[PDB]
Amino acid sequence: SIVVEWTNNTLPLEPCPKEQIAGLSRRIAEDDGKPRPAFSNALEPDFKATSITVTGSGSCRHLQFIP
Amino acid sequence: SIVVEWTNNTLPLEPCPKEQIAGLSRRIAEDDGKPRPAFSNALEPDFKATSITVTGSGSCRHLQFIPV
Amino acid sequence: GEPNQRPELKNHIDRVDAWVGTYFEVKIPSDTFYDHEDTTTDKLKLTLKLQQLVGEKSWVQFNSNSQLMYGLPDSSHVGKHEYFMHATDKGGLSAVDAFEIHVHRRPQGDRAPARFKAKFVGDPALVLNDIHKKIALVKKLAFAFGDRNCSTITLQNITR
Amino acid sequence: PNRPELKNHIDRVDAWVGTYFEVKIPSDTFYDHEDTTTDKLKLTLKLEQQLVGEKSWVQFNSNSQLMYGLPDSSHVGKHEYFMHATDKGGLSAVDAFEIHVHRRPQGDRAPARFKAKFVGDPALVLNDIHKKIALVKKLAFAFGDRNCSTITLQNITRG
Ligand SMILES: [Ca+2]
Ligand SMILES: [Cl-]
Ligand SMILES: [Cl-]
């Protein structure tokens, strides 16, 4: 399995943009880990996504967004 | 005449990224105010550029990049 | 043979984040709506519903054919806005998704490292009235820096 | 022959760790007298005329005259490359330009960390710069940001 980690460098640093990160999180994943078709179809055919995780860091170090 | 002011929102705030602004400056403008073809052709046909001015601000408040 | 079932909303368009002077673009996902007979969202008729005047001066626009939402807000649009996305099937039944567009203040504010100015020929009315010309301006200025079709340009002012 | 000439240096390519960059060669870079603009000439990217390798984080398509790449943490700093333009007289001209690789735009103060698990082995990505370049471009497309580099790769590991 290939675990790929990235950051969206458009997010503001402070204060914690929890509402912006949430929207970005639910756009690629459902309530659980399941990737949405926008994300599956974009990474296909070269990469097939199984599970997505979005955890907070920095100003959002305490929150978690996608299980 | 239409004077348009804009910022490239990908530029870092601090320290003064004078070297990046310079590169961006010479790609759209020559040493003087003259727009380069990459800038002219991109704005055509809707807009015809006449003169470009780029001055520094914020962390680059003291510098000026176009003209010269 | 069977009664038309109403389209259903599966995944809320929750939030659209936009910035003053900066082009934004949101393509409506296909798993947003789902109809028993007409399937996914691209197979439904979408209509965005919210002011005006004679000119299409709305800072938000929506193409129903591409199902693409786009726009370019100014300083007077900062804050939260509530919109409604309507999805109608072939039988005329509809589902509605209420979502919010939050327009933030101009990126970087006054700590921007550089202020670019350019003078063009003509009257500023063709841009300061027509949102589509003003969208063209900002997309072409990004293209002039090699940034294809990206929102790396933030419009600061247009004057004479 | 003719000598092909240099009017406007490629000058500066600003790049960031973990972020895809793309620079298409302008037509007013080189200007020959007999062959005209930079488009018709044969362009080759070089380091002592040492060709860019297959695992190089910078690449150059001679057909599209497109320079692109994806640097990692070991490439931070300023880099000087040389663009060779050969005319139909066989002569060459050289443009020395600079690629300055900055640190990741947010570093470790990023507000969120995204992770995704795919099917395969991390070697197939961590060996081929192009497969890793596709990954990063498709990650941007998943957010509707195609060809914008709004994605900064933080790590690739096995799970
Ligand atoms: Ca139906
Ligand atoms: Cl704000
Ligand atoms: Cl840096």
Coordinates of C-alpha atoms and ligand atoms in Angstrom, one line a residue:
Chain A
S1 CA 0.0 0.0 0.0
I2 CA 1.1 3.6 -0.7
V3 CA 0.4 6.2 2.0
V4 CA 0.8 9.7 0.4
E5 CA 0.7 12.8 2.6
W6 CA 0.2 16.3 1.3
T7 CA -0.9 19.8 2.3
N8 CA -3.1 22.3 0.5
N9 CA -0.8 25.4 0.5
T10 CA -3.8 27.7 -0.1
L11 CA -5.1 27.4 3.5
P12 CA -4.4 30.3 5.8
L13 CA -2.1 29.6 8.7
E14 CA -3.8 31.4 11.6
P15 CA -6.4 31.4 13.0
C16 CA -7.3 27.7 12.6
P17 CA -9.4 27.6 9.4
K18 CA -11.4 24.6 10.6
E19 CA -14.4 25.5 8.5
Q20 CA -12.3 25.8 5.3
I21 CA -10.4 22.5 6.0
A22 CA -13.7 20.7 6.7
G23 CA -15.1 21.7 3.3
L24 CA -11.9 20.5 1.6
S25 CA -12.1 17.3 3.6
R26 CA -15.7 16.4 2.7
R27 CA -15.0 17.3 -0.9
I28 CA -12.6 14.3 -1.3
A29 CA -13.9 11.9 1.4
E30 CA -17.2 10.9 2.9
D31 CA -17.9 10.7 6.7
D32 CA -15.7 7.7 6.9
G33 CA -12.5 7.1 4.9
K34 CA -14.2 6.5 1.6
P35 CA -12.9 8.6 -1.3
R36 CA -15.6 10.5 -3.3
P37 CA -15.7 10.0 -7.1
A38 CA -14.1 13.4 -7.7
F39 CA -11.0 12.1 -6.0
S40 CA -11.1 8.6 -7.3
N41 CA -11.8 9.7 -10.8
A42 CA -9.0 12.3 -10.7
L43 CA -6.3 9.8 -9.5
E44 CA -7.5 7.0 -11.8
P45 CA -6.2 5.1 -13.7
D46 CA -2.7 5.5 -12.4
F47 CA -3.6 5.4 -8.8
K48 CA -6.7 3.7 -7.1
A49 CA -7.6 5.4 -3.8
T50 CA -8.8 3.3 -0.8
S51 CA -9.0 5.5 2.2
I52 CA -8.5 9.2 3.0
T53 CA -7.5 10.7 6.3
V54 CA -7.4 14.4 7.2
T55 CA -5.9 15.4 10.5
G56 CA -5.2 18.8 11.9
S57 CA -1.8 20.4 12.5
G58 CA -0.2 23.7 13.5
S59 CA -3.0 26.0 14.5
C60 CA -5.4 23.1 14.2
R61 CA -3.1 20.6 16.0
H62 CA -6.0 19.5 18.3
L63 CA -8.8 18.8 15.7
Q64 CA -9.3 15.8 13.4
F65 CA -11.5 16.1 10.3
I66 CA -11.8 12.7 8.5
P67 CA -11.8 9.4 10.5
Chain B
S1 CA -7.2 54.6 -20.4
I2 CA -7.5 51.7 -18.0
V3 CA -5.0 51.4 -15.1
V4 CA -5.2 48.0 -13.4
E5 CA -3.5 47.3 -10.1
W6 CA -3.0 43.7 -8.9
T7 CA -0.9 41.5 -6.7
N8 CA 0.5 38.0 -7.2
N9 CA -0.9 36.2 -4.1
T10 CA 1.7 33.4 -4.3
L11 CA 4.5 35.7 -3.3
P12 CA 5.9 35.2 0.3
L13 CA 5.4 38.1 2.7
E14 CA 8.7 38.0 4.7
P15 CA 11.6 38.4 4.1
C16 CA 11.3 40.7 1.1
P17 CA 11.4 38.3 -1.9
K18 CA 13.0 40.9 -4.1
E19 CA 14.6 38.2 -6.4
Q20 CA 11.2 36.6 -7.1
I21 CA 9.5 39.9 -7.9
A22 CA 12.4 40.8 -10.2
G23 CA 12.0 37.6 -12.2
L24 CA 8.3 38.1 -12.4
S25 CA 9.0 41.7 -13.4
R26 CA 11.3 41.0 -16.4
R27 CA 8.9 38.3 -17.8
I28 CA 6.1 40.7 -18.4
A29 CA 8.1 44.0 -18.8
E30 CA 11.5 45.0 -20.3
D31 CA 14.0 47.2 -18.5
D32 CA 11.7 50.2 -19.1
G33 CA 7.9 50.3 -19.0
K34 CA 7.5 48.4 -22.4
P35 CA 5.3 45.3 -22.0
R36 CA 6.9 42.1 -23.4
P37 CA 5.0 39.9 -26.0
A38 CA 4.2 37.3 -23.4
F39 CA 2.2 39.9 -21.5
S40 CA 0.8 41.6 -24.7
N41 CA -0.3 38.3 -26.3
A42 CA -2.0 37.1 -23.1
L43 CA -4.1 40.2 -22.7
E44 CA -5.0 40.4 -26.4
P45 CA -7.6 40.7 -27.9
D46 CA -9.6 42.1 -25.1
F47 CA -7.0 44.4 -23.7
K48 CA -4.0 46.2 -25.2
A49 CA -1.3 47.1 -22.7
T50 CA 0.6 50.4 -23.0
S51 CA 2.9 50.7 -19.9
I52 CA 3.6 48.6 -16.9
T53 CA 4.6 49.8 -13.4
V54 CA 5.8 47.6 -10.5
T55 CA 6.7 49.2 -7.2
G56 CA 7.6 47.4 -4.0
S57 CA 5.5 47.4 -0.8
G58 CA 5.3 45.7 2.6
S59 CA 8.6 44.0 3.2
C60 CA 9.8 45.4 -0.1
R61 CA 8.6 48.9 0.7
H62 CA 11.9 50.6 -0.3
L63 CA 12.5 48.8 -3.6
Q64 CA 11.2 49.6 -7.1
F65 CA 11.4 47.0 -9.9
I66 CA 9.8 48.6 -13.1
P67 CA 11.0 51.0 -14.5
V68 CA 14.7 49.8 -14.6
Chain C
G1 CA -45.5 2.5 -15.5
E2 CA -44.0 3.7 -12.2
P3 CA -44.3 7.0 -10.4
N4 CA -41.4 9.4 -10.8
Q5 CA -39.3 9.5 -7.7
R6 CA -37.9 12.8 -6.5
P7 CA -34.2 13.5 -6.9
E8 CA -32.3 13.2 -3.6
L9 CA -29.4 15.0 -2.1
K10 CA -26.5 12.8 -1.1
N11 CA -23.5 15.1 -0.5
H12 CA -24.0 18.7 0.5
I13 CA -22.0 21.4 -1.3
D14 CA -21.1 22.6 2.2
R15 CA -19.0 25.7 1.7
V16 CA -17.5 27.6 -1.2
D17 CA -14.5 29.8 -0.1
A18 CA -13.7 32.8 -2.2
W19 CA -11.5 35.9 -1.9
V20 CA -11.9 39.5 -3.0
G21 CA -10.4 40.3 -6.3
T22 CA -9.6 36.6 -7.0
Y23 CA -11.3 34.3 -9.5
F24 CA -12.9 31.2 -8.0
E25 CA -14.3 28.1 -9.7
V26 CA -16.4 25.2 -8.3
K27 CA -17.6 22.3 -10.5
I28 CA -20.6 20.7 -9.0
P29 CA -19.7 17.1 -8.1
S30 CA -21.7 14.3 -9.7
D31 CA -22.4 12.6 -6.3
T32 CA -24.1 15.8 -5.1
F33 CA -27.6 14.8 -6.3
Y34 CA -28.9 11.4 -7.3
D35 CA -32.2 10.4 -9.0
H36 CA -33.6 6.9 -9.2
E37 CA -34.5 7.3 -12.9
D38 CA -32.0 9.9 -14.2
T39 CA -28.9 8.8 -12.1
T40 CA -26.1 11.2 -11.3
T41 CA -25.8 15.0 -11.0
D42 CA -24.4 15.6 -14.5
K43 CA -27.7 14.0 -15.8
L44 CA -29.9 16.6 -14.0
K45 CA -30.7 20.2 -14.8
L46 CA -29.0 22.4 -12.2
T47 CA -30.1 26.0 -11.5
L48 CA -28.4 28.3 -8.9
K49 CA -30.8 30.7 -7.0
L50 CA -30.0 33.4 -4.6
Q51 CA -30.7 41.5 -6.3
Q52 CA -29.8 42.7 -9.8
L53 CA -30.2 45.5 -12.4
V54 CA -30.2 45.2 -16.2
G55 CA -26.6 43.9 -16.5
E56 CA -25.5 40.5 -15.2
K57 CA -23.4 42.2 -12.5
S58 CA -23.7 39.2 -10.1
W59 CA -20.3 38.4 -8.7
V60 CA -21.3 34.7 -8.9
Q61 CA -22.2 33.0 -12.1
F62 CA -23.4 29.5 -13.0
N63 CA -23.2 27.6 -16.3
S64 CA -25.9 24.9 -16.3
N65 CA -24.4 23.1 -19.3
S66 CA -21.0 22.6 -17.7
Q67 CA -22.4 22.6 -14.2
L68 CA -19.6 25.1 -13.3
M69 CA -20.0 27.8 -10.7
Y70 CA -17.6 30.7 -10.9
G71 CA -17.2 34.4 -10.0
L72 CA -15.1 37.3 -8.7
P73 CA -16.1 39.3 -5.7
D74 CA -15.2 42.8 -4.8
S75 CA -14.8 44.6 -1.4
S76 CA -18.5 45.0 -0.9
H77 CA -19.1 41.2 -0.9
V78 CA -16.9 40.2 2.0
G79 CA -18.8 38.0 4.4
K80 CA -21.2 35.0 4.3
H81 CA -23.7 34.5 1.5
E82 CA -26.4 31.8 1.3
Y83 CA -27.3 30.2 -2.0
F84 CA -29.6 27.4 -3.2
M85 CA -28.7 24.8 -5.8
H86 CA -31.8 23.3 -7.5
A87 CA -31.6 19.9 -9.3
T88 CA -34.6 19.1 -11.5
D89 CA -35.1 15.7 -13.2
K90 CA -36.8 14.9 -16.5
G91 CA -40.2 14.8 -14.9
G92 CA -40.0 18.2 -13.3
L93 CA -39.3 17.2 -9.6
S94 CA -36.6 19.1 -7.8
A95 CA -34.2 18.8 -4.9
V96 CA -32.5 21.8 -3.3
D97 CA -29.1 22.1 -1.6
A98 CA -28.6 25.2 0.6
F99 CA -24.9 26.1 0.7
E100 CA -22.8 29.1 1.8
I101 CA -20.2 31.2 0.0
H102 CA -17.9 32.9 2.4
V103 CA -15.9 35.8 0.7
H104 CA -12.8 36.6 2.6
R105 CA -10.7 39.8 2.5
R106 CA -8.1 40.3 -0.1
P107 CA -5.2 37.8 0.4
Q108 CA -2.1 39.3 2.1
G109 CA -4.0 42.6 2.7
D110 CA -1.4 45.5 2.6
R111 CA 1.6 43.3 3.4
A112 CA 1.9 42.3 -0.3
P113 CA 5.5 42.5 -1.4
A114 CA 4.8 44.2 -4.7
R115 CA 2.1 46.2 -6.4
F116 CA 1.8 45.8 -10.2
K117 CA 0.2 48.4 -12.3
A118 CA -0.6 48.3 -16.1
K119 CA -2.3 50.8 -18.3
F120 CA -4.5 49.7 -21.2
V121 CA -6.5 51.5 -23.9
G122 CA -10.2 52.1 -23.6
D123 CA -12.8 52.9 -20.9
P124 CA -12.8 51.2 -17.5
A125 CA -16.6 50.7 -17.9
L126 CA -16.2 47.6 -20.1
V127 CA -14.6 45.8 -17.0
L128 CA -16.1 47.6 -14.0
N129 CA -19.6 46.9 -15.4
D130 CA -19.2 43.5 -17.1
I131 CA -18.2 40.8 -14.6
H132 CA -17.2 38.5 -17.5
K133 CA -14.7 41.0 -18.9
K134 CA -13.4 41.5 -15.4
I135 CA -13.0 37.7 -15.1
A136 CA -11.2 37.6 -18.4
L137 CA -8.8 40.3 -17.2
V138 CA -7.8 38.4 -14.1
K139 CA -7.4 35.0 -16.0
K140 CA -5.3 36.6 -18.7
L141 CA -3.1 38.4 -16.2
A142 CA -2.4 35.0 -14.6
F143 CA -1.7 33.6 -18.0
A144 CA 0.8 36.4 -18.6
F145 CA 2.9 35.1 -15.7
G146 CA 2.8 31.5 -17.0
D147 CA 0.2 30.4 -14.4
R148 CA -2.3 28.9 -16.9
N149 CA -5.8 29.0 -15.6
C150 CA -5.1 29.7 -11.9
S151 CA -6.2 32.2 -9.4
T152 CA -2.6 33.5 -8.7
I153 CA -3.7 37.1 -9.4
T154 CA -5.6 39.3 -6.9
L155 CA -7.2 42.4 -8.4
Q156 CA -6.4 45.5 -6.2
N157 CA -8.1 48.4 -8.1
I158 CA -9.3 49.5 -11.5
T159 CA -9.3 53.2 -12.3
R160 CA -8.5 55.8 -15.0
Chain D
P1 CA 25.2 28.2 -40.6
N2 CA 24.3 31.9 -40.0
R3 CA 25.3 32.7 -34.8
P4 CA 22.0 32.3 -32.8
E5 CA 21.6 35.1 -30.3
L6 CA 20.3 35.6 -26.8
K7 CA 18.0 38.6 -26.1
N8 CA 16.1 37.7 -22.9
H9 CA 17.7 35.3 -20.4
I10 CA 15.3 32.7 -19.0
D11 CA 16.4 34.5 -15.8
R12 CA 14.8 32.9 -12.8
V13 CA 12.6 29.8 -12.2
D14 CA 11.2 29.9 -8.6
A15 CA 10.3 26.4 -7.3
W16 CA 9.3 24.9 -4.0
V17 CA 9.9 21.6 -2.3
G18 CA 7.2 19.1 -2.9
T19 CA 5.4 21.3 -5.5
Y20 CA 5.1 20.9 -9.3
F21 CA 6.5 23.7 -11.4
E22 CA 6.3 24.4 -15.1
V23 CA 8.0 26.9 -17.3
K24 CA 7.4 27.1 -21.1
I25 CA 10.3 28.6 -23.0
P26 CA 9.4 32.1 -24.3
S27 CA 9.9 32.9 -28.0
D28 CA 11.9 36.1 -27.3
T29 CA 14.6 34.2 -25.3
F30 CA 16.7 33.3 -28.3
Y31 CA 16.7 35.3 -31.6
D32 CA 18.6 34.1 -34.6
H33 CA 19.1 36.2 -37.7
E34 CA 18.5 33.4 -40.3
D35 CA 16.2 31.2 -38.1
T36 CA 14.3 33.9 -36.2
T37 CA 12.7 33.1 -32.8
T38 CA 13.4 30.5 -30.1
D39 CA 10.7 28.2 -31.4
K40 CA 12.3 26.6 -34.5
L41 CA 15.7 25.9 -32.8
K42 CA 16.6 22.7 -31.0
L43 CA 16.8 23.3 -27.3
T44 CA 18.6 21.0 -24.8
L45 CA 18.9 21.5 -21.0
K46 CA 22.4 20.9 -19.6
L47 CA 24.2 21.2 -16.3
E48 CA 29.8 20.9 -18.3
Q49 CA 27.3 20.0 -21.1
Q50 CA 26.1 17.2 -18.9
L51 CA 22.6 16.1 -19.9
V52 CA 19.8 16.1 -17.4
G53 CA 19.3 12.5 -16.3
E54 CA 16.1 10.4 -16.2
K55 CA 15.8 10.7 -12.4
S56 CA 16.5 14.4 -12.4
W57 CA 13.9 16.5 -10.5
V58 CA 14.1 18.9 -13.5
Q59 CA 13.0 17.7 -16.9
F60 CA 12.8 19.3 -20.4
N61 CA 10.6 18.2 -23.3
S62 CA 12.4 19.3 -26.4
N63 CA 9.2 19.0 -28.5
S64 CA 7.0 21.4 -26.5
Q65 CA 10.0 23.4 -25.2
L66 CA 8.5 22.9 -21.7
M67 CA 10.6 22.7 -18.6
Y68 CA 9.0 21.0 -15.6
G69 CA 9.8 19.2 -12.4
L70 CA 9.3 18.5 -8.7
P71 CA 12.0 19.1 -6.1
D72 CA 12.4 17.4 -2.7
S73 CA 14.1 18.5 0.5
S74 CA 17.6 17.8 -0.8
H75 CA 17.3 20.4 -3.6
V76 CA 16.7 23.6 -1.6
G77 CA 18.8 26.5 -2.8
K78 CA 19.9 28.1 -6.0
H79 CA 20.8 26.0 -9.1
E80 CA 22.3 27.2 -12.4
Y81 CA 21.4 25.4 -15.6
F82 CA 22.3 26.0 -19.3
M83 CA 19.9 26.0 -22.2
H84 CA 21.5 25.2 -25.5
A85 CA 19.9 26.4 -28.7
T86 CA 21.2 24.9 -31.9
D87 CA 20.4 26.4 -35.3
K88 CA 20.0 24.9 -38.8
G89 CA 23.6 26.0 -39.3
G90 CA 24.7 23.6 -36.6
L91 CA 26.0 26.4 -34.4
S92 CA 24.8 26.7 -30.8
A93 CA 24.0 29.4 -28.3
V94 CA 23.8 29.0 -24.5
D95 CA 21.6 30.7 -21.9
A96 CA 22.7 30.3 -18.3
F97 CA 19.6 30.6 -16.0
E98 CA 18.8 30.0 -12.4
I99 CA 16.3 27.6 -10.6
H100 CA 15.9 28.6 -7.0
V101 CA 14.3 25.9 -4.9
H102 CA 12.7 27.4 -1.8
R103 CA 11.4 25.5 1.3
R104 CA 7.9 24.2 1.4
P105 CA 5.6 27.2 1.3
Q106 CA 4.1 26.5 4.8
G107 CA 6.9 24.2 6.2
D108 CA 5.5 22.5 9.3
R109 CA 3.1 25.2 10.4
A110 CA 0.5 23.8 8.0
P111 CA -3.1 23.9 9.4
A112 CA -4.0 20.4 8.1
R113 CA -2.2 17.2 7.0
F114 CA -4.0 15.2 4.2
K115 CA -3.2 11.5 3.9
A116 CA -4.4 9.0 1.3
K117 CA -3.7 5.3 0.9
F118 CA -3.5 3.8 -2.6
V119 CA -2.9 0.3 -4.0
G120 CA 0.8 -0.4 -4.8
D121 CA 4.3 0.0 -3.4
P122 CA 6.0 3.4 -2.7
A123 CA 9.0 2.4 -4.8
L124 CA 7.0 2.7 -8.0
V125 CA 6.5 6.4 -7.1
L126 CA 9.7 7.3 -5.2
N127 CA 11.8 6.0 -8.2
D128 CA 10.0 7.6 -11.1
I129 CA 9.9 11.4 -11.0
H130 CA 7.2 11.4 -13.7
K131 CA 4.9 9.0 -11.8
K132 CA 5.4 11.2 -8.8
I133 CA 4.7 14.3 -10.9
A134 CA 1.5 12.7 -12.2
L135 CA 0.4 12.0 -8.6
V136 CA 0.9 15.6 -7.5
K137 CA -0.9 16.9 -10.6
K138 CA -3.9 14.6 -10.1
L139 CA -4.0 15.5 -6.5
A140 CA -4.5 19.2 -7.5
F141 CA -7.2 18.1 -10.0
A142 CA -9.1 16.3 -7.3
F143 CA -9.7 19.7 -5.7
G144 CA -10.5 21.4 -9.0
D145 CA -7.1 23.0 -9.1
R146 CA -5.8 21.4 -12.3
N147 CA -2.3 22.7 -13.3
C148 CA -2.1 25.1 -10.4
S149 CA 0.3 23.5 -7.9
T150 CA -2.0 24.1 -4.9
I151 CA -0.7 20.8 -3.5
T152 CA 2.6 20.4 -1.6
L153 CA 3.8 16.8 -1.2
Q154 CA 4.8 16.2 2.4
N155 CA 5.8 12.5 2.4
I156 CA 5.3 9.1 0.7
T157 CA 5.6 6.0 2.9
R158 CA 4.3 2.5 2.9
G159 CA 1.3 1.3 4.9
Ligands
CA1 CA -36.9 11.2 -10.8
CL2 CL -11.2 36.9 6.3
CL3 CL 12.9 29.6 1.2

